[PDB]
């Protein structure tokens, strides 16, 4: 079963309609099928072109009075801001009056690559004391990045499989690379130190994690869900193995990014 779970994480998509704030204020759109596990800037040289003609005269994106961050993965952004919203996704395009106060300057392509490898490294740190990624010659890092950028699933996982192995003697990873985003995008994410297995050898379940680090998402009466707990657009069962979750439904940056919605 597992390999298909991985393929269907990798290829999850978001239908998206870019329209211009100045066409809306004055609405011909650009339709695209955004990869859920990529980042805006990575696939917005194209958008820059399409509307570059009309750019007679520094481009950012927005959604219902909310700038969209260049370094959160697309899928997480959708899940967190607009899961219940009707499709296709309506992203406003603004190339004037950049929100420096409420937005990071648009990263280059290399600056994103920086963030991506930096996240992969912060992940292998918590997973294997950095012993796995460090070993890798620079070319392997580049293979990871180019496999993401070019949607080459096979290429990318050829290298990532090593990063999802763990010692025989252990029942999983050291800690789990995870981030939890709550009410809004401007709300900080949550990251903590959690072990895949407890003292008694029991494998930890997502339910255990949310009970520990985020109990406000647990009905204190029946121990079941109080809010929506979304990952890659679905809601797994609170009794799902966190070790397995990390191995199979992390974003390519090896994190379990987890949206929480009331």
């Amino acid at each position: 079963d597992d390999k298909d779970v991985l393929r269907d994480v990798w290829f999850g998509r978001i239908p998206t309609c870019f329209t211009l704030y100045q066409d809306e204020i004055t609405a011909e759109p650009y339709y695209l099928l955004l990869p859920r596990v990529s980042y805006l800037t990575l696939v917005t040289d194209k958008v820059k072109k399409h509307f570059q003609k009309v750019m007679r005269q520094e481009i950012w994106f927005e959604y219902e009075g909310t700038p969209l961050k260049w370094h959160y993965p697309i899928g997480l952004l959708f899940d967190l801001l607009a899961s219940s919203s009707a499709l296709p996704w309506n992203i406003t395009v603004h190339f004037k009056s950049f929100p420096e106060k409420d937005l990071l300057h648009c990263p280059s392509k290399d600056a994103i690559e920086a963030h991506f490898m930096s996240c992969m490294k912060e992940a292998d740190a918590l997973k294997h004391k950095s012993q796995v990624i460090n070993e890798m010659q620079k070319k392997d890092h580049k293979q990871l990045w180019m496999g993401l950028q070019n949607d080459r699933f096979d290429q990318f996982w050829a290298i990532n499989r090593k990063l999802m192995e763990y010692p025989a003697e252990e029942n999983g990873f050291r800690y789990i690379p995870f981030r939890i985003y709550q009410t809004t995008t401007e709300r900080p994410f949550i990251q903590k130190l959690f072990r895949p297995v407890a003292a008694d050898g029991q494998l930890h379940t997502l339910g255990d994690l949310l009970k520990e680090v985020c109990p406000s998402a647990i009905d204190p009466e029946d121990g079941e869900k109080k809010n929506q707990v979304m990952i890659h657009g679905i809601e797994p069962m609170l009794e799902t193995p966190l070790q397995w979750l990390s191995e199979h439904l992390s974003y390519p940056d090896n994190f379990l990014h987890i949206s929480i919605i009331p």
């Binding site: 239908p15 499709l87 797994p236 069962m237």
Partner: peptide, 20 residues
């Protein structure tokens, strides 16, 4: 849980990709 994850992903794919 595994079957729920796989199937839910199946269905997720179908709504969002199928239609459009």
């Amino acid at each position: 849980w595994k079957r729920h994850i796989s199937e839910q992903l199946r269905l997720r794919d179908r709504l969002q990709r199928q239609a459009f």
